[PDB]
Amino acid sequence: MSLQFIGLQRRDVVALVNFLRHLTQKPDVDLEAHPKILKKCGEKRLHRRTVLFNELMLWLGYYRELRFHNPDLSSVLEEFEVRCVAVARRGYTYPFGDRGKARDHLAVLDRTEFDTDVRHDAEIVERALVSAVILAKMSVRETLVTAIGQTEPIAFVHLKDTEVQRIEENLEGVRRNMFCVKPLDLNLDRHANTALVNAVNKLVYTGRLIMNVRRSWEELERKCLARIQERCKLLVKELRMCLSFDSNYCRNILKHAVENGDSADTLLELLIEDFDIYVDSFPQS
Amino acid sequence: DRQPLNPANIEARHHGVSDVPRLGAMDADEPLFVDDYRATDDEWTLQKV
Amino acid sequence: KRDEKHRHVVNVVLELPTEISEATHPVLATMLSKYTRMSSLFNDKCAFKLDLLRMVAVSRTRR
């Protein structure tokens, strides 16, 4: 697709095109994480109108690519369900010191189900994980917290500190790049650990992964929409200084407010389609 | 036309730009062309009254 | 030789009098590329006429 700009040498155009082309192959996929690419857009070398237009075009293309590569959630949720059921079974088998609170925590583990919409996953996996951690701590009879209004924090059980920080690094890398999924060479199963503990460790890893992916995508999409809206409003503000046919045409194109991905795609396609009609309104060099 | 509309069949009217396909699409049944503004509840009840 | 199809749209599709032409009407000259790109639906003449009218209107707009 002919994603096109104004006031750029062809080398910068192919640089931007290649940057979008290889977005997922690099760490820290956030746009502000690459000040060189963002600055190549035209800052301080061109008039305000054209640099704003170029930034808006780049943001639209970046948002389109991100929405294109948004990954599949199904297999991870299925794995989480399977592991939750396994933890529940192992907990039902185990001879706890007192069966009372173990009973209701196992009931909570049994109650877990995923909704059709993706916005509710965080809280349900949070409660499932906290109940699983409470069960695991009970199994090795550690003094779980009981302060008023306090709750048990989510943490791995009986793993070495180095391995814990390695897993934290892996999850952080997942947060840096949603699309790449770095596998663990580290093995969470230990001969020195009870099967219940191993199952809880697997479940907590999967829940952390899900929460990280969801939160990262949500905030990235929010940022993209905010940037696009701000650029559109400022560019509309600038175009009102002139009153030619081409400038009025561009303003009417920018009339549509963008707060949804589909509206963003329509705006981008319309802006590309009628490029030759309004191009001369922008000065260059 | 026949079926519930759903958002795939709703199109936004581009005002003040060339829209020849829409002008030809006049008298067509299925695709519904709308402005992107959506009425709020208060003005909905005012229209009703 | 784009001139032949531009003349086609201007004369048979837009049916403009000869006093109006690609040379003397800047917005018409601008819209000619868009109109020539969509070779289909030249049968629906009123659509092209109405689009030209609203293009003139937006050209004159002061808001």
Swiss-Prot record, chain A:
Interacts with host BICD1 and RAB6A. Interacts with small capsid protein UL48A; this interaction links together the capsid and pp150. Interacts with host CCNA2. Belongs to the herpesviridae large structural phosphoprotein family. Phosphorylated by host CCNA2. This is Large structural phosphoprotein. Participates in the last steps of viral maturation and release. Associates with nuclear capsids prior to DNA encapsidation and later preserves the integrity of nucleocapsids through secondary envelopment at the assembly compartment. Interacts with host CCNA2 and thereby blocks the onset of lytic gene expression to promote establishment of a quiescent state of infection in undifferentiated cells. It comes from the Viruses. It is found in: Virion tegument; Host cytoplasm; Host nucleus.
UniProtKB/Swiss-Prot annotation, chain B:
It is found in: Virion; Host nucleus. Self-assembles to form an icosahedral capsid with a T=16 symmetry, about 200 nm in diameter, and consisting of 150 hexons and 12 pentons (total of 162 capsomers). Hexons form the edges and faces of the capsid and are each composed of six MCP molecules. In contrast, one penton is found at each of the 12 vertices. Eleven of the pentons are MCP pentamers, while the last vertex is occupied by the portal complex. Belongs to the herpesviridae major capsid protein family. Homomultimer. Makes the hexons and eleven out of twelve pentons. Interacts with triplex proteins 1/TRX1 and 2/TRX2; adjacent capsomers are linked together in groups of three by triplexes, heterotrimeric complexes composed of one molecule of TRX1 and two molecules of TRX2. Interacts with scaffold protein; this interaction allows efficient MCP transport to the host nucleus. Interacts with capsid vertex component 2/CVC2. Interacts with the small capsomere-interacting protein/SCP. This is Major capsid protein. The gene is MCP.
From Swiss-Prot, chain C:
The keyword DNA-binding does not apply. The keyword Metal-binding does not apply. It is found in: Virion; Host nucleus. It comes from the Viruses. GO terms for cellular component: host cell nucleus; viral capsid. Keywords: Capsid protein, Host nucleus, Virion. One of its GO terms (biological process) is viral process. Belongs to the herpesviridae small capsomere-interacting protein family. Participates in the assembly of the infectious particles by decorating the outer surface of the capsid shell and thus forming a layer between the capsid and the tegument. Complexes composed of the major capsid protein and small capsomere-interacting protein/SCP assemble together in the host cytoplasm and are translocated to the nucleus, where they accumulate and participate in capsid assembly. Interacts with the major capsid protein/MCP. This is Small capsomere-interacting protein. It comes from Human cytomegalovirus (strain AD169). The lineage of its organism: Viruses, Duplodnaviria, Heunggongvirae, Peploviricota, Herviviricetes.
